[PDB]
Every structure is written in C-alpha cells, then in structure tokens.
Amino acid sequence: IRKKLVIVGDGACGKTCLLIVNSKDQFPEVYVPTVFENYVADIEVDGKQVELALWDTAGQEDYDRLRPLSYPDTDVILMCFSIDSPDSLENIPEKWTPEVKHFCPNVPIILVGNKKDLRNDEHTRRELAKMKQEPVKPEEGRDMANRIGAFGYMECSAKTKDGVREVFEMATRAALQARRGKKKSGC
C-alpha cells in the first residue's frame, strides 16, 4: 500500500510537468517549479489501493549534489527522456542507467518517453530536420527499454494528458512486485 517512486532524466525532459499532471490533473501552463515535492498519489491498481510517493529530482548542474538523497527505499523508477530530443534518449544508457543501477540495483525501471504530442508537431519537426534529426520513434524507446533491462517502455504527453494515467498505473504495478522480486538475494 505505501510505495516510493523516483523520477529521473535530463533537464527539461518534462519530469515535473508529468508529476503535476498526474497529481492535480492539469498541465501547469505558466509557472513550473524546478521540482514538484511532497505529494503522495492515491492509485487503485487492480486489487489494492496504493499510496505512491512521488519524488522529483533535477540537475541544471548543482541539484546534482542532492539527487543521491532521493534514492534510499525506492520501489520504482520512472526514467524519462523526451520524444522531441534524441539527445535525451542517448543520455538514458550513458548517464541515467548507470546512476540508477548504482544507487537502486534491483528496483524496477519504467522507461518513459515524454512530450509525445511533439512527435508530429511542425515546429519540432523543422527544428530537428535542420540537424538531420527526427522525433524519437516508439521502436527506439522499446529497444532502449530492452537494452537497459527496463520493466517496460511507455509514452505520454503531460501537455495533452494522453498516456499519463497509464504511466503511474504501470509504475504502481511495478512497485508492488518489488517485494516479490526482493526475495531473491545474491551475496
């Protein structure tokens, strides 16, 4: 019933907005805090009633120094990149995966592609085209999930809310596992 979630990934990949949307059911259009803190989410996930604490983190450089304090006792990690940022995805296996395996060796990971609303957005496609890039594809996110050992890959849009609800339900399932896973152891 009581579970701990930690959300990690590159600056500006949409972590805080995802947690705000899950929690308050509206995308923050003007003010957005660096971290959304102290929120326990009530989730029904079939059978139990879970209280899922949502622990947000950040970087922007020095918030680097505090992040480590976030991992004790986590039940489930959401590891994010944004679908408008091929760069964010390469950071998954390069940065976030070693960091989380180090601090949370056997905690389940949900790999999440955020900003799914941008995948056919015109300005995004133009901006990326000029670099000979394109939005991340679902196949890529699934294979990265495969590679790093994730429990699964999901996509969402905090902006439209599409897919958000399912992210937190799958994370809750993962955390329950875890426890368962755890147981286982180894040594």
Binding site: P33, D62, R65, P68, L69, Y71, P72, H102, G186
Partner: protein
Amino acid sequence: SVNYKPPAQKSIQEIQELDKDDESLRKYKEALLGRVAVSADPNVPNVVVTGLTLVCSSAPGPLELDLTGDLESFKKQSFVLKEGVEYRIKISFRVNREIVSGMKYIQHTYRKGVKIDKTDYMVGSYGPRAEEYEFLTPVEEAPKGMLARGSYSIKSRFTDDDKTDHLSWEWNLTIKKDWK
C-alpha cells in the same frame, strides 16, 4: 561503469537563491530531506561508523558490535547464529558535516583461513544529520548443512565513491545446529 561527483555548501545556497518563494522554495525544501550539519571542524571524522547489528528475531540475546570501541577483541569472540535463520545486517553510522555519495558496505567472508564469499551492499547518498543512520541490508539467511556449519570470519569495509575507508573491522560468525 559508475561515476564520481562532488561539490558543496555554497552549491545548495546557490540553488536556493535561484531567487526565493520562487523554484527556490522547492529547492530549499529538498535540501531539507538531505538535512542539518553538526561540526564546522574538519578534524572531526565526517563519517563515524558506530556499530554493526544482526537483526534476528529468533536470537535469544544481543548481537551488536560497538565499533567506536576496541576492534581487535572481536577476533577473540563470535556471534552464534542457528543454521537457516533469517537476519539483516544493520550498520549504524553518523554523517556529521558533509554529504557522502555512493556509500557502500562490503563483506568478504572467510572459512578456515580462506575467503569463500564477497558481498557488496549499496547504502546510498547520505547528507549530514544530528541523528544517527541505520542502514539495513536485504534479508539474508544463515547457512545450513554440514558443509555450512562452522566458524566464519568477516572482513567488513564501510566505504564510498572516493573509496574512503570510513571503517574496517573483522568479526566472527559461528553457524551451529542450535542457539544453545
């Protein structure tokens, strides 16, 4: 692979501033958580490992090592554990002034002079606090069987990302048929 880182403080402050409230606040818150610290101074020392405790519900008496005291005398004593019983290893420590990253608790166990096991435990990043910390390892079981009973000797090391020796000590674990 991882890484480391660290740084711081300032840073945170710055962050916170950024401014405030705003974011810053948140951042611061966160920071706070982390926290605080303490111281400043440085020296202390920043980290003072104060004790080891085997959390075992079945055990008729205490199973604690005061690590702020004399460490050699532990080699002339032992902890008796009945075969198969579950237990966790609680490492009591104080992070006084600075945030310590990637803390690790390592145990290399020996039987009749030779090393038969190596286990690393991820403790994590800990910021300064007036209140002591207690790190519990996952539930472990004492070994069972003819080839598993006997005297062991564990060389423990509480360390971190910069591979600092917060404390090193040797303690013994004698596995028996009954607590007696």
